[PDB]
Amino acid sequence: RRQPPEEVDVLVVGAGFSGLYALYRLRELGRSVHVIETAGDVGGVWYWNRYPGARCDIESIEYCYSFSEEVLQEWNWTERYASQPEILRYINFVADKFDLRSGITFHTTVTAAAFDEATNTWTVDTNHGDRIRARYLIMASGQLSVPQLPNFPGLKDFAGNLYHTGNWPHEPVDFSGQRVGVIGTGSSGIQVSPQIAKQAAELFVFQRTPHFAVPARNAPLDPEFLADLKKRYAEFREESRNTPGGTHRYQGPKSALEVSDEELVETLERYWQEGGPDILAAYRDILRDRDANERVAEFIRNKIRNTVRDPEVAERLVPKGYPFGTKRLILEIDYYEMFNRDNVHLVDTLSAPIETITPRGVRTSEREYELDSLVLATGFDALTGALFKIDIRGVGNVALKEKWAAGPRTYLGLSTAGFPNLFFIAGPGSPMYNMLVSIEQHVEWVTDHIAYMFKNGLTRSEAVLEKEDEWVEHVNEIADETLYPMTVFMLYVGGFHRYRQICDEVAAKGYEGFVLTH
Ligand SMILES: Cc1cc2nc3c(=O)[nH]c(=O)nc-3n(C[C@H](O)[C@H](O)[C@H](O)COP(=O)(O)OP(=O)(O)OC[C@H]3O[C@@H](n4cnc5c(N)ncnc54)[C@H](O)[C@@H]3O)c2cc1C
Ligand SMILES: NC(=O)c1ccc[n+]([C@@H]2O[C@H](COP(=O)([O-])OP(=O)(O)OC[C@H]3O[C@@H](n4cnc5c(N)ncnc54)[C@H](OP(=O)(O)O)[C@@H]3O)[C@@H](O)[C@H]2O)c1
């Protein structure tokens, strides 16, 4: 294990996509930088979420780095949507190309960080006892980096094998001949269940809230397509940077209501057959009005009812109530087709809640389920989970967990008043669709600001309380034009293109909203 240095210009937490780029760029900018990563290697979510079927929901050609021309040319994506193993190879390939691991401390977790106004420096501590002093602290700790253990009664009494998709074994697990239970039907559960059902004797999928999922229609990547794209990859990426989703996507111009029944069915079957989340933008007001939303929602519901041979099973797979697209749209591969298998059973925990885990399995208010293995696909902590596991003290030793107790309050989602020289990558308050585009934009803005601080001899950068309140209010206001609040708003819904413009303007105006001092 590598030892974190005593002093550094910038200390980064996290060796996922965000922290690795920050490390690369701050090196290129002539700054001393170092990373602290709990995991044994690089990758972030793609190092932890090694469960079978883990797959990206953004097309390979978009979900990738663009800062390096060599990488864009030498790497060859193979499928429309990259599997977790491939994304990890891609990440390790970048870490190898640029010798990043020499500036990373693995097998180490940041536990405390306190800002000292006297020296304008952060003092960062780790569980292993290391103490690092850094002028700036970059939190690349992620949004879903804390696997959340569902507070199930009697969980410790389970006699079989317990797995969590967010911390999957680094050696493949063979479920052949087992009775397996999967708890959770989000992205993780929908992706891992079809893979497990190929091995297990009996698979029990425990679902509480049913969610929307459309077919991914994953396909090999035409190698000649990739060849032509590489001769124009920089232009293609700038295109992507000028979109609301940070990805190429057709923008439906027509209102979901003004169309006929046959036209709405044919347009949506088009998307349903083409696959992917682009169906979200089939019509311009899917996420703008409940009526347009429900019209597109019923079509998907009926596609479910038509795929599941058993109408009893189908109707509980059909989401109802909350609107379509308000939660990140899941892509499924043979998931709804799974429930037509004879070794798969859908357990509706809305009708029969889980009372306790037992030595032999899971006991709902209906029966006890005997399971050889239990797979928890129960998501992660909120976007603040990685930060709340750290004792973060700012001016006046006020802990961040307190100020953010009523929610995370930031300026631009990048900084928070009372906590200078601290920046969040891909955190709350910023756009979160194609995270690789948003991550590159965030790393560049932050490391540009840090280079700016060193260039001008300034040593303390702090967001202004009033602008923080203004930002929190603006983010809230733009949200009310959408159906998102129907589930301190954390997500910026304005779109990547408009957000980047905002951030560039702030930077082009001497970092308006910040207070730089020495
Ligand atoms: C299973 C899964 C699938 C996803 N699929 C997609 C997708 O298809 N498209 C998309 O756009 N986004 C997707 N995401 C979102 C994902 O968070 C981002 O795409 C991106 O990978 C996040 O990069 P990051 O480096 O900011 O965070 P992470 O990859 O989460 O990296 C954070 C790292 O920081 C470490 N860390 C945290 N706290 C500490 C600490 N105190 N000390 C030391 N180390 C610490 C963690 O161990 C982790 O390695 C997915 C996320 C998950 C979990
Ligand atoms: N690109 C991809 O393919 C991919 C893959 C994995 C994850 N992700 C992303 O990472 C995020 C999390 O994904 P995720 O699937 O792992 O988690 P998730 O989306 O938060 O869903 C967790 C599921 O487990 C259920 N659950 C949680 N606690 C439970 C309990 N105590 N009892 C019963 N059920 C419980 C939840 O039911 P309820 O809904 O009723 O609460 C939910 O269905 C998502 O935003 C997703 O976009 C993406």
From Swiss-Prot:
Gene3D superfamilies linked: FAD/NAD(P)-binding domain
Is the keyword Flavoprotein in the record? Answer: yes
Q: What is its EC number?
A: 1.14.13.92
* SUPFAM superfamilies, alphabetized: FAD/NAD(P)-binding domain
Q: Which reaction does it catalyse?
A: phenylacetone + NADPH + O2 + H(+) = benzyl acetate + NADP(+) + H2O
What does the entry report on temperature?
Answer: Thermostable. Displays an activity half-life of 1 day at 52 degrees Celsius.
Tell me which residues bind FAD. Answer: 18, 37, 45-48, 57, 63, 110, 143, 435
- Identify which cofactors the protein needs according to its UniProt entry: FAD
Keyword terms, alphabetized? FAD, Flavoprotein, Monooxygenase, NADP, Oxidoreductase
Q: Which residues does the record give as NADP(+) binding sites?
A: 55-57, 185-191, 208-209, 327-328
Residues in a coiled coil are none
Q: How is activity modulated by pH?
A: Optimum pH is 8.0.
Q: Name one GO molecular function term.
A: NADP binding
Q: How is the cofactor bound?
A: Binds 1 FAD per subunit.
* Annotated site location: Transition state stabilizer: 328
Q: Describe its partners and assembly state.
A: Monomer.
Q: Return the similarity comment.
A: Belongs to the FAD-binding monooxygenase family.
Purpose of the protein:
Catalyzes a Baeyer-Villiger oxidation reaction, i.e. the insertion of an oxygen atom into a carbon-carbon bond adjacent to a carbonyl, which converts ketones to esters. Is most efficient with phenylacetone as substrate, leading to the formation of benzyl acetate. Can also oxidize other aromatic ketones (benzylacetone, alpha-methylphenylacetone and 4-hydroxyacetophenone), some aliphatic ketones (dodecan-2-one and bicyclohept-2-en-6-one) and sulfides (e.g. methyl 4-tolylsulfide).
**Name this protein carries in UniProt:** Phenylacetone monooxygenase
UniProt gene name: pamO
